[PDB]
């Protein structure tokens, strides 16, 4: 089964009960009580795209623990949103500059340093690429698409610079449906 977290080396919060139980507080807390024409004010975008977006922001949000590496060790997960925010990258790209506000929130949602360095292995979790495309409807590369980590800090900066209330409407529901979900399963 694939992991969120472990604290000895056993599965103590799989992948799938730590992104449906977090849905219940993006859909309950936030999407039905109005939250989508709060997003649409300040993505500038419409309502129902801004309701999709915040599902699949969540449930992009952990796939960086999806690595081969960390499944296997069993221990920890350290630097995951950054590959979280990598594969966020390529897979929002299609929505544009907002896209990019998505993978800059998910980036910033466990900064506990404000330097990480390439990964031998890349390649994700085939079963946990599996529990993505069926709860998200998308397709997720394989490989954690290392886009020499440079391109995207300059213009993480360039984005909290210009657009940190874009990123904070994305990041706070996140951490706090984040936060929610390792409450009950763990």
């Given amino acids: 089964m694939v992991c969120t977290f472990f604290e000895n080396k056993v599965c103590v919060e799989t992948m799938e ?13 936030y999407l039905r009580r109005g939250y ?4 649409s004010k300040i993505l500038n975008i419409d309502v129902k795209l801004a309701e999709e977006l915040l599902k699949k ?14 499944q296997q060790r069993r221990e920890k997960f350290r630097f995951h949103e950054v590959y979280s925010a990598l594969v966020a990258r390529e897979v ?5 500059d907002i896209g990019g506000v998505v993978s800059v929130a998910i980036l910033l949602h466990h900064h ?3 330097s990480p360095k390439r990964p031998r292995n890349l390649k994700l979790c085939n079963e ?14 394989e490989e954690i698409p290392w886009r020499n980590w440079i391109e995207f800090t300059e213009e993480a900066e360039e ?7 874009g990123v904070y409407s994305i990041l706070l529901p996140l951490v706090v449906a984040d936060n929610y979900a390792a409450a009950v399963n763990r």
């Fill in 128 to 141: 946990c690429l599996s529990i993505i495309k069926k709860l998200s409807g998308e397709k997720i590369p």
């Fill in 92 to 96: 929002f790209k299609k929505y544009g």
């Fill in 57 to 70: 922001a969540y449930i992009f949000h952990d796939i960086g623990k999806c690595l081969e590496e960390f």
């Fill in 159 to 165: 984005i909290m610079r210009t657009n940190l209330r």
């Fill in 112 to 114: 506990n340093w404000i």
């Fill in 36 to 39: 989508g024409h709060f997003l």
């Fill in 17 to 29: 009960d730590h992104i449906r139980k977090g849905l219940e507080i993006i859909e309950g807390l």
